[PDB]
């Protein structure tokens, strides 16, 4: 890994820690194009991701990613996801083929269709299917909450406001990855996310991020 512990309050946009995806679509289930203009800072000290439309039936989305790689340790995010059918707001670690490594990823994803729930998942050497849906007891879209994952060699623990919500112990990822955040509308996954209805603009806000090395 190339990165160390850090605390990001989002008082400004630190180009030394982050970079914006721009000018391309992930393809597959992503029905939008990443644009640097879709990642911006608010006056209230927050990073905001947006889902907008530049023309008929075309969508623009946002993705923020870290410059360095991070390994084992505690990952915390204080955020508020977007609320709307057919979309996803997330916080995850990622590394893959493009980077010349196995596909190792750990996720925290909010299905816009129902913000009273949260989904946890992970990929190890490209193998996923570890989805775990948890009831939050509140509407994540209404206020800020702290979401976290403790990534250790033999286990992954997920928390909501300090409370342990789920643990994973098999086929734990090992490759350090970049910290990422995104907001997007899907296609071909109606059963999972619901059918996107074209409503824009939509926003996901990030208050602060923290990574504490092992
Ligand atoms: Ca802040």
Question: Could you name the key traits of this structure?
Answer:
monomer; 214 residues; mainly beta; Jelly Rolls; 16 strands; 49% strand; globular; binds calcium ion; Beta-glucanase/XTH; EC 3.2.1.73; glycosidase
Number of strands: 16
Kindly estimate the percentage of residues that lie in beta strands according to DSSP: over 45%
CATH architecture: Sandwich
Order of helices and strands: EEEEEEEEEEEEEEEHE
- How many discrete structural domains? 1
Taking all Cα atoms into account, the compactness measure Rg is: 16 Å
What's the end-to-end separation, in Å? 11 Å
The share of residues in helices is under 10%
Structural class comes to mainly beta
Number of helices: 1
Structure explained in plain terms:
The chain is mainly β. The chain has a single domain, classed as Jelly Rolls, CATH 2.60.120. It has 1 helix and 16 strands. The protein has a 16-stranded mixed beta sheet that branches. Strand 10 (117-123) and strand 11 form a beta hairpin. The longest helix is centred in the last third of the chain and has 4 residues, at 190-193. The N and C termini lie close together (11 Å). It binds calcium ion. Calcium ion (CA) binds next to strand 16. The PDB classes it as hydrolase (glucanase).
Summarize the structure.
It is classed as hydrolase (glucanase). With 214 residues, this protein is mainly β.
List the helices and strands and how they pair.
Layout: E1 6-8, E2 18-20, E3 33-34, E4 39-41, E5 47-55, E6 58-66, E7 73-80, E8 87-95, E9 104-111, E10 117-123, E11 132-135, E12 145-152, E13 155-160, E14 163-168, E15 178-185, H1 190-193, E16 202-213
Parallel strand pairs: 3-6
Antiparallel strand pairs: 1-16, 2-6, 4-5, 5-6, 5-16, 6-15, 7-12, 7-16, 8-9, 8-15, 9-10, 10-11, 12-13, 13-14
The structure holds calcium ion.
